[PDB]
Structure formats: structure tokens, C-alpha cells
RNA sequence: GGCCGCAAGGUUAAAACUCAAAUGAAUUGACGGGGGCCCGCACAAGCGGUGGAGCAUGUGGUUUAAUUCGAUGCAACGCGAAGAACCUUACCUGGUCUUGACAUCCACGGAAGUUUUCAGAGAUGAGAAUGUGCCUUCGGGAACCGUGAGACAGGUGCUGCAUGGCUGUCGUCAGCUCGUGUUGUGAAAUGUUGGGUUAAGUCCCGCAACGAGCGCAACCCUUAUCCUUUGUUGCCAGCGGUCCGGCCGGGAACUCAAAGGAGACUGCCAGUGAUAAACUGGAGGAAGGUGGGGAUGACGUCAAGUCAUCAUGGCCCUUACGACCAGGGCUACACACGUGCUACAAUGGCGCAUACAAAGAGAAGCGACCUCGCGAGAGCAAGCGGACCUCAUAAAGUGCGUCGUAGUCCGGAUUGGAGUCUGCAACUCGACUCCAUGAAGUCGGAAUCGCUAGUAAUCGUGGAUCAGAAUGCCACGGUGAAUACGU
């Protein structure tokens, strides 16, 4: 992966950490039933002025050693290729080849 | 196969009566692994058939088979670039198997209302020497007789 | 197991987790200190419930 | 055909692991990344001290690292003036208290990683690959191995068409799972591209 | 040209020009519409499909501003993709910066929280509040925000015919080689061939050969039978309480959980055989001759695949082939092909009510009981980092009614109207619900595919990726066949 894609990812995670509580507040307002019916309009109109990159759904899981955007596993933080390499070298505790 | 000897699998006898022939008939009739449906159909058909002839179900079944069992058949040979029909004798297990297969195939082709009804009608016609099963047997024998020169 | 197309040719792996439970019925102060002052290997996970 | 990794197929039967610890799903990935960074730093820092293995353990809430080396003096230094520095840096990277231990390799000529490193080092100074390979095999068989195999591949001698060559002596049974086989690899960077090296050493059944 | 012959022709017999070879006898392979022996769902004997209809998905072509790049006989075509609305994104149109979005150096001053204006946004301008730690021997500047100059940074740009690493295929086929000796001027041969035998260059006997290596077999996982340790969250035959329920007092026997052990080796009997290796039957036993299923891939072949995971020689661009942004495209549509799903019906469609599983996942997670809604869902809220709580109700089956051979009470494409949820945001281009509409299709030409037993066929259940998006991929159990005379 190019050196600018990883930079994009770092920026995304930073902003998402920064604006976490404000968004939860605004969204609870918009969701809650029996509201003033103008506070709803205000909260909706304000939730879209925050930076786009602050939403957790703009983030992409990547391999921690290479940057590959496909073939990701969550237990290991790596893609299939690097998982296999480390497994055969002996660096993943408890993992071995299986048959049954 | 090329270098094999295959033994015989055992087959349980029928629960109501005690015949292995009837178990094989159920097996030949079943589809998709549903043995209960096949047993229902066969038992109902034999029930409705025993009356029409005033004999035991087994006797009706045996008399029906004895008119469809074949004796000689034709195999195909081609070594000189031409196809020849060579007559051969059929052996007992194959006789029974072919009879059952033809009976069920004829039954499925009729146009009555229920499968049990079709099966019963076919068995009765067979006991009277009419129907597609007997026609098939006659055709096979005719072909075998017409090629006696290649025995 | 290939960097490109081939779609069969996979590898299969396993991790196994072993678990044990021990019960102590009648304790005393000395014993509880004795347990809380013990060390074990670098690959075992210990949980104590009172 | 293609072959299976010897170490991999043998884990749990006759070969041990390089990392030992227990963790759950919310710590597994972070622990792996920390181990990777530790090994990278140590391997860069000790390039001339004949390192062959780094073993990591994580007990309680600290980290202890064992280094297997063939020149322990160069690592320990004058009354610890280098081991202490290494410990400080490793503690900074790990984020918890740190401990370092040093273990010695008696015979560097029966070690898979060290033989391969020596061959690559020679190839980068314009030595003849046949000479390097034959010397490796003879040393190993002289000091007591039951068998050895060596393989080299690439643009050998500056050629335009790449190639592969190997030599063998003794027994090297790869289909036997109770056999004690040591395996490793290395790479050499030259003016014509990359050359690859592989080494197998057999020591007996168990 | 001469001689000879009725003729057909015979006999004597050159040059110009052109090429760097033409040729004999043996040697190792490959090939034969040459011979001999033996294997494999190769054929034969059988069961179910594809090719025709509608829909899902990939490919060729054509179109477009763009429809990003790669895989191409078997061994590419639900393939890299284990999940394109923005992001992912590498493509198109327009608005913008230049030591830079990501690093190391030098020296000029100070840092992060809210809140206003013009912008589609990137990015420009106005404000308010704060003064950190710390040898301050005053130099700390370490921590992290600004700007200036130049050594540099950056490239999913080309060559897989310059490469490392990783993979496909012949093929889980039984082959492939060396040392010393001996034969031939030599290339080479012998061993490795021969008589028997095996799944096997497996084993025995012979023999100018005597020995060893890589493969074959065995050691590893799982499944089927037994006994000895521990018995909660798992189990109840005997005993005794009754609100009926493993509920409760208890028990350690049985299911089951998971650690150490026993067992299968042609070991025993009879016949055949070279006084062999082996073969065919029989006893006991849960299991018999490799008991059943995995993992395990020899020397080599195809300049086979991948510079777009990564790494790397050579070439190429640096106010641009390198940054940032909002909209669009990868989802197009005269047409051709591969792989699948649902059907064309009575061994069935619809309504009532009732047995019986296995294996998995869960903290920004799995969401009970109760209330509201016809429903997709909504509100309030226990429990659980789990043999305890939750996801979570198996379906085919069985019992009783009805439909009566009809393009149907079969099938469910298409289209109108109204909703729910995830998410800043569902026009292009998401999944699901409700009322309505009710297309093709009555078993598919020449061709052509899978399968030898708990297999084929048929019914349901779980997980990875993942805010949301499976008819694909990887796993689990239920019911349960037909056929193998033979080469």
C-alpha cells in the first residue's frame, strides 16, 4: 500500500476518537421520542456540520505489517499471507496444523 | 471392476409380512430417502388388490411377477466395426430385478388419480397378461429370437 | 496459500484451550495468604473467586 | 512439486515454539505487534554478534527475552554497559518491565541460521558459491551431523539466466515426523539482484 | 557429336551455375492406424443432473467523460474479491499546494479545550480562555504546534523473457539416482533385467555384481470397544419429602466431560506352493488382513502464475506519472459462453397440532420476561467474558380435514401504493414488511457432467469478512437407495 493511505487511516482514527461524545449526545437527541420537534430539526442540522472523517464507518481494517485492504483476520491483526508466514516460523502461540 | 470381489449386502425383511422380495420392491419404489411414503403406497395397493382376486397379497404378487420375468436378452458387440446383437441367458436375481423395474416404470406412466391406484391397476393387468410390462417382455423375446444366428 | 488466483489449495489451523476448576471448602487466613503468595508458569491464566 | 515447512509440520511433536503466553481476543493482536517490533530492533542492533534465536515470554505483567548467541561477550560488554541499554530500550517498546537473558551456542557449525548467514556474507564479497557450499557441508559432517543439505538460487556469478543448485551428504529424511531436522533461510543483496539460500541439518531420531 | 536399331531406345560421354555439407555403422530417448502383461467411476451395469424457461453471479463484445488493473485449452471464467452507496479506489470532469500528505538534519517563536464569518469542500480570516511539567549553575525544549532553504522525500509507473519468496500441473503415479568393481576405441551398459508375489523398485529365490541415498511403508490427528483417577455449572438406580419439577435431603452406581493405560501382529487352525515369499477359507473378538477418514507431493516438465501483498537489479517522472477535496463511474445493453438458485405439481399445495439433533459465536457484544404494532419492528429492562445466561422454535416426519388433473387453491418474474432499520447520507445503487397485479414453464435438439456406502438423492442448522448488505465459500447433524456378469 502507498504511504499516503496509511496516513489517511491515522487521521481517521484520531478524529473519531476526538468527537466521540458529542455525536452520541446529538444522536440520542434525534432518536428520543417525545421531543420538542424543533430540537430534533436542530440536532439533525448540526450533526452534519462536523467533519465527515469523524464517523467510525469511514475506517478500513488493514494489515499491520503491509497495508493490504483484503483478506483480514481480526484475532491476529494480519492478512492471510503474513499469518501463514508467522505461523510456520513459530511465532503464534498455540497455533498448528489441524486435521480431523 | 477389474480385480475385485464384492460381497452381498444384507437386507432386512418387511415388518408387516416377512419377505425380502417385498423389501426390495419398496426400495426400488422409493425416492429421495423417504421410505415411509413408499411403504404406505405399497401396503395400500396390496390391500386393494387382495380383494379383486380373492387370494393372499403374496400370492397375487408372485403370480403378477411370473408373467413379467424374462429369460433371454441381447447384448451389443462391436469388434469388426459393426454392431451385433448377441443373445444371452438371464440369471435369476436379474430376472426379478428387471421385472420389478418394468412394473414400476409402467405404473408411473398411467393416468389415474393416485399412485396406489395406478400400482394396483398395473398389477391386476399383469396378472391378466396385458399392459406395458408384458409388452416389454414380448418385445425383448422377439428381438432375441430374431438374432438366433449369432449365438 | 497463493499470492494470486488459485482458489482451492488452502491451509487449516487450530487453537485449543484447556480449562480446569478447583474448589476449596474450608479456608483459613494462613492458607489464603499462602495462595495469594504463589507464582506459576508464564503460560497459565489463574482466576480466584471468593 | 511444492514442499511443506519442516519446522511447521513438526511443531508439537519434536519441536518447540518461539513464543509462550496466554491471552484473550482483546490482547492477542497487540501482543503480536509488540513482539514483532522487539525482534526487529534487536536484530538490527546485534547484526555482528551471531544471533540465532530470540525467545519471548510474558509472565504476570512483564516481559522476559532470551537471546541465543555465539559471541556472548560482544553482547554483554564491559560489566553490562550494553545489556543495560538494550533492556532500557526494550522496556520502552514493550511498555512494561523488562528482563534480558543470554544463552550460548557451543557449535556454530551445526546451526541452520548461522551457516546460511555465513554463506550470504561470503556471497556479498565476491566469493565462489561452489567453494562456499562445499566448505559448509564438510564442516558440518566433520563435527558430527548425521546429514546436511544446502541449496542456492538466483543469478549466480552474474549470469543472465537464473539457476538453482544443491549439495547433500548423509541422511536427510523429510517424511519422518520423529526426526530432528533444523531448517532456516537467508538472502543476499548483490549488484545483479537477490540470491536465496536454504539449509537442512539432521541430528537423529527421538 | 559418332556408332548401332523398323521403332521404342541402347552405348560412349562434358561445361556454365550453385551449396558447406551429402553419407556409413552403432548409442540414449520419444513416437507407431507394431506385439505382450497390468492398473484407474476409463468403459460396461445403474441413480440423479446440465444444454430449453425466469432470476443470481463471472467472462467476451459494444457503448461511454470514465466504464480501474490482473487471471485465457485440460491446469481462466461465484477466479485475486473472506463481502464497490461515501470511505475502500488504483478510473473521469472541475477547484487547489510545492522540502511537500509520510521521514532525518539546521534555526526563528511558541503548545489543547469553544465559537463566529465566506467556501461544495479542500482551505482562508475575526475572536475569547489557558501559561505545563523542569539541574534553570539561566545554556534544558527532550514532549509538540507554526515558517524558511536544501541535501531529500514520494510513484498500485514498465519489464514475472533480469530475480527472491509463495503457488498450479503431470500425480499419491512408483519411480529417480550415486560410490567402488567389471564390459566396450567410444557415446554408454550392468546393478534397476529374469521366475513368483504385493496397493507399492513390497518381499523371496536366481544372476559380474557388491553396497547406499531420495521416494513407498511405519512414528502424527480423528473415529468404533474396554478400566482407573476427579465429579461442578454436568448425571439420577436404589433411599425419603411432595406445591409433579432433579424441584429438595442426598448418592458416586449409569450417561457424559478429559488425563494415564490395554487392544489387531497373518498372532492361532486347515488346505495350495520351490523343504520359500505369499494366497484361499475357519475360530475367538467391538473391530481382520492398509478396520474407516485426514495430514504428508521424489529428480524434473510447462522461459506456466504473480514487479498490484511484500522484497529487489535496470529504465523512467520530479511546480508532476507525486498531494488534498466535492460530484460521477467500476452496477451501462442489439448480442455469445461458463457456474448456480427456484420450478413446470397429487411420492403434491393449503389449515389445524405433535416426536426426535450435531457443531459454533458473544463487551462500542449476545438481548430474555413484560407492554404496544396485522407485520418488518419499538419502549422498559434481568443474565452472561459463559458444561450456568443469550443467540435458539430444527426441518423433512406422524394424525385429522380440504383441493380433484385445470396453465390449477401448481409457479412467483414484473409493476403500483404505503412503511421499518443501519448509517453524516439509501436518486443513480441497500436489505426486510404490508395491500394489490399474477409473466415464461406441461420435463427440454445435436452434445455433455457427478457418484461404489452412511456414498448418490433429499431436509434443515452454524461461522469468517462485516455499521448495513449470500442463491457464493468453509463446517454440522436427520432420513437413506440402485448396480458391478466382465475387460
Curated annotation (Swiss-Prot), chain A:
Source organism (scientific name): Escherichia coli (strain K12)
Annotated protein name in UniProt: Small ribosomal subunit protein uS14
Disulphide bond pairs: none
Cell division as UniProt keyword: no
GO cellular component: cytoplasm; cytosolic small ribosomal subunit; small ribosomal subunit
Domain of life: Bacteria
GO terms classed as biological process: cytoplasmic translation; ribosomal small subunit assembly; translation
Protein's UniProt keywords contain Ribonucleoprotein: yes
Annotated InterPro entries: Ribosomal_uS14, Ribosomal_uS14_bac/plastid, Ribosomal_uS14_CS
Family: Belongs to the universal ribosomal protein uS14 family.
Keywords on record: Ribonucleoprotein, Ribosomal protein
PROSITE patterns named among the record's database cross-references: RIBOSOMAL_S14 (PS00527)
Subunit structure: Part of the 30S ribosomal subunit. Contacts proteins S3 and S10.
One Pfam family in the UniProt entry: Ribosomal_S14
GO molecular function: rRNA binding; structural constituent of ribosome; tRNA binding
Protein purpose: Binds 16S rRNA, required for the assembly of 30S particles and may also be responsible for determining the conformation of the 16S rRNA at the A site.
Swiss-Prot record, chain B:
Keywords: Ribonucleoprotein, Ribosomal protein, RNA-binding, rRNA-binding, tRNA-binding
Keyword rRNA-binding: yes
Recorded consequence of changing residue 35 to A/E: Defective in ribosome assembly
An annotated GO BP: negative regulation of translation
GO terms assigned for molecular function: mRNA binding; rRNA binding; structural constituent of ribosome; tRNA binding
A single GO cellular-component term on record: membrane
Subunit structure as annotated in this protein's UniProt entry: Part of the 30S ribosomal subunit. Contacts proteins S9 and S11. Cross-links to IF3 and the P and E site tRNAs.
Note: The strain K12 sequence is shown.
Protein family per UniProt: Belongs to the universal ribosomal protein uS7 family.
General function of this protein: One of the primary rRNA binding proteins, it binds directly to 16S rRNA where it nucleates assembly of the head domain of the 30S subunit. Is located at the subunit interface close to the decoding center, where it has been shown to contact mRNA. Has been shown to contact tRNA in both the P and E sites; it probably blocks exit of the E site tRNA.
Name of this protein: Small ribosomal subunit protein uS7
Taxonomy of the source species: Bacteria, Pseudomonadati, Pseudomonadota, Gammaproteobacteria, Enterobacterales
From Swiss-Prot, chain C:
Signal peptide location: none
Protein family per UniProt: Belongs to the universal ribosomal protein uS10 family.
Subunit-structure text: Part of the 30S ribosomal subunit. Can also form a heterodimer with the transcription antitermination protein NusB. Binding of S10 to NusB is mutually exclusive with its incorporation into the ribosome. The rRNA transcription and antitermination complex (rrnTAC) consists of RNAP, NusA, NusB, NusE (this protein), NusG, SubB, ribosomal protein S4, DNA and precursor rRNA; S4 is more flexible than other subunits.
Summary of the function given for this chain in its UniProt record: Involved in the binding of tRNA to the ribosomes. Part of the processive rRNA transcription and antitermination complex (rrnTAC). The complex forms an RNA-chaperone ring around the RNA exit tunnel of RNA polymerase (RNAP). It supports rapid transcription and antitermination of rRNA operons, cotranscriptional rRNA folding, and annealing of distal rRNA regions to allow correct ribosome biogenesis. In complex with NusB is involved in the regulation of ribosomal RNA (rRNA) biosynthesis by transcriptional antitermination.
Name of this protein: Small ribosomal subunit protein uS10
Organism (species): Escherichia coli (strain K12)
Curated annotation (Swiss-Prot), chain D:
Gene Ontology CC entries for this record: cytoplasm; cytosol; cytosolic small ribosomal subunit
GO MF annotations in UniProt: mRNA binding; rRNA binding; structural constituent of ribosome
Entries under Gene3D superfamilies matching the protein: 3.30.300.20, Ribosomal protein S3, C-terminal domain (3.30.1140.32)
Cross-referenced SUPFAM superfamilies: Prokaryotic type KH domain (KH-domain type II), Ribosomal protein S3 C-terminal domain
UniProt superkingdom: Bacteria
Annotated signal sequence range: none
Protein keywords: Ribonucleoprotein, Ribosomal protein, RNA-binding, rRNA-binding
GO annotation, biological process: cytoplasmic translation; ribosomal small subunit assembly
SMART domains per the UniProt record, alphabetical: KH
InterPro entries reported in the protein's UniProt record: KH_dom (IPR004087), KH_dom-like_a/b (IPR015946), KH_dom_type_2 (IPR004044), KH_sf_prok-type (IPR009019), Ribosomal_S3_C_sf (IPR036419), Ribosomal_uS3_bac-typ (IPR005704), Ribosomal_uS3_C (IPR001351), Ribosomal_uS3_CS (IPR018280)
Domain KH type-2: 38-106
Known partners and oligomeric status: Part of the 30S ribosomal subunit. Forms a tight complex with proteins uS10 and uS14. With proteins uS4 and uS5 encircles the mRNA as it enters the ribosome, which may play a role in mRNA helicase processivity. Some nascent polypeptide chains are able to cross-link to this protein in situ. In collided ribosomes contacts ribosome rescue factor SmrB.
Family label: Belongs to the universal ribosomal protein uS3 family.
Function: Binds the lower part of the 30S subunit head. Binds mRNA in the 70S ribosome, positioning it for translation.
HAMAP family: Ribosomal_uS3_B
Protein name listed in UniProt: Small ribosomal subunit protein uS3
Amino acid at each position: 500500500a502507498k504511504q499516503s493511505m496509511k496516513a489517511r487511516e491515522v487521521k481517521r482514527v484520531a478524529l473519531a476518537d476526538k468527537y466521540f461524545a458529542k455525536r452520541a449526545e446529538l444522536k440520542a437527541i434525534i432518536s428520543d421520542v417525545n421531543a420538542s420537534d424543533e430540537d430534533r430539526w436542530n440536532a439533525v442540522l448540526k450533526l452534519q456540520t462536523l467533519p465527515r472523517d469523524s464517523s467510525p464507518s469511514r475506517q478500513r481494517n488493514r494489515c499491520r505489517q503491509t497495508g493490504r485492504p483484503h483478506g483480514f483476520l481480526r484475532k491476529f491483526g494480519l492478512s492471510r499471507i503474513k499469518v501463514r508466514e508467522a505461523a510456520m516460523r513459530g511465532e503464534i502461540p498455540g497455533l498448528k496444523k489441524a486435521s480431523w | 471392476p477389474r480385480r475385485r470381489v464384492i460381497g452381498q449386502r444384507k437386507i432386512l425383511p418387511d415388518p408387516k409380512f416377512g419377505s425380502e422380495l417385498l423389501a426390495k420392491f419398496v426400495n426400488i419404489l422409493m425416492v429421495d430417502g423417504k421410505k415411509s411414503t413408499a411403504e404406505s403406497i405399497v401396503y395400500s395397493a396390496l390391500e386393494t388388490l387382495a380383494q379383486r382376486s380373492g387370494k393372499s397379497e403374496l400370492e397375487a404378487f408372485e403370480v403378477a411377477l411370473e408373467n413379467v420375468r424374462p429369460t433371454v436378452e441381447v447384448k451389443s458387440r462391436r469388434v469388426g466395426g459393426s454392431t451385433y446383437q448377441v443373445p444371452v441367458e438371464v440369471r435369476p436375481v436379474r430376472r426379478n430385478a428387471l421385472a420389478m423395474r418394468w412394473i414400476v416404470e409402467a405404473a408411473r406412466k398411467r393416468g389415474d388419480k393416485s399412485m396406489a391406484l395406478r400400482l394396483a391397476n398395473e398389477l391386476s393387468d399383469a396378472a391378466e397378461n396385458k399392459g406395458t410390462a408384458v409388452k416389454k417382455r414380448e418385445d425383448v423375446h422377439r428381438m432375441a429370437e430374431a438374432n438366433k444366428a449369432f449365438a | 496459500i497463493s499470492p494470486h488466483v488459485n482458489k482451492d489449495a488452502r491451509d487449516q489451523y487450530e487453537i485449543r484451550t484447556h480449562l480446569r476448576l478447583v474448589d476449596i471448602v474450608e479456608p483459613t487466613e494462613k492458607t489464603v495468604d499462602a495462595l495469594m503468595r504463589l507464582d506459576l508458569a508464564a503460560g497459565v491464566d489463574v482466576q480466584i473467586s471468593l | 512439486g511444492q514442499k511443506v515447512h519442516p519446522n511447521g509440520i513438526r511443531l508439537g511433536i519434536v519441536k518447540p515454539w518461539n513464543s509462550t503466553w496466554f491471552a484473550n481476543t482483546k490482547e492477542f493482536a497487540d501482543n503480536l505487534d509488540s513482539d514483532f517490533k522487539v525482534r526487529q530492533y534487536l536484530t538490527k542492533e546485534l547484526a555482528k554478534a551471531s544471533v540465532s534465536r530470540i525467545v519471548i515470554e510474558r509472565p504476570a505483567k512483564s516481559i522476559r527475552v532470551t537471546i541465543h548467541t555465539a559471541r556472548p561477550g560482544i553482547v554483554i560488554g564491559k560489566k553490562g554497559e550494553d545489556v543495560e541499554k538494550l533492556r532500557k530500550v526494550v522496556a520502552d517498546i514493550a511498555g512494561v518491565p523488562a528482563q534480558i537473558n543470554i544463552a550460548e551456542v557451543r557449535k556454530p557449525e551445526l546451526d541452520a541460521k548461522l551457516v546460511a548467514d555465513s554463506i550470504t556474507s561470503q556471497l556479498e564479497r565476491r566469493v565462489m558459491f561452489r567453494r562456499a557450499m562445499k566448505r559448509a557441508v564438510q564442516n558440518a559432517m566433520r563435527l558430527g551431523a548425521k546429514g546436511i543439505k544446502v541449496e542456492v538460487s538466483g543469478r549466480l556469478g552474474g549470469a543472465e539466466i537464473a539457476r538453482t543448485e544443491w549439495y547433500r551428504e548423509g541422511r536427510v529424511p523429510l517424511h519422518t515426523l520423529r526426526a530432528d531436522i533444523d531448517y532456516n533461510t537467508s538472502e543476499a543483496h548483490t549488484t545483479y539482484g537477490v540470491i536465496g539460500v536454504k539449509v537442512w541439518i539432521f541430528k537423529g531420531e527421538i
